[PDB]
């Protein structure tokens, strides 16, 4: 079929400077790209990192050298390891995946605060 994926998009929202686990829920057929986005007050959403199912992972210039991204295709689960108190900046985090022709599935996100 042209599209064979339900909405799904359940986003686990761990708190603090810990590992965030984004997982896919439902029935899917094929997957091409999934990543994370960050949005801050009086600003627009931004790309931090992403992984192609069979390829390489890119990074952002300001963020590179501070974090890391891990993924597992057996359970379709991505763990974004956040270093303990290393990120001074705080904002709203979203999980994005262009599962499936292919269509975007924006999902509800979480928030956190890392102030002085």
């Amino acid at each position: 079929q042209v599209q064979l994926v339900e909405s799904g998009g359940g986003l686990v929202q761990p708190g603090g400077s810990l590992r965030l686990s984004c997982a896919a829920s439902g029935s899917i057929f094929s997957i091409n790209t999934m990543g994370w986005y960050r949005q801050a007050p009086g600003k627009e959403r931004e790309m931090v990192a992403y992984i192609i199912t069979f390829g390489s992972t890119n990074y952002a210039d300001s963020v590179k050298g501070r974090f890391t991204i891990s993924g597992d295709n057996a359970n379709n689960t991505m763990w974004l390891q956040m270093n303990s108190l290393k990120p001074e900046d705080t904002a709203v985090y979203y999980c994005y995946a262009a599962i499936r022709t292919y269509t975007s599935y924006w999902g509800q996100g979480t928030q956190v605060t890392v102030p002085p």
Partner: peptide
């Protein structure tokens, strides 16, 4: 020839 996708804001 590596392929990727994305959204339009």
């Amino acid at each position: 020839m590596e392929l990727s996708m994305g959204p339009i804001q």
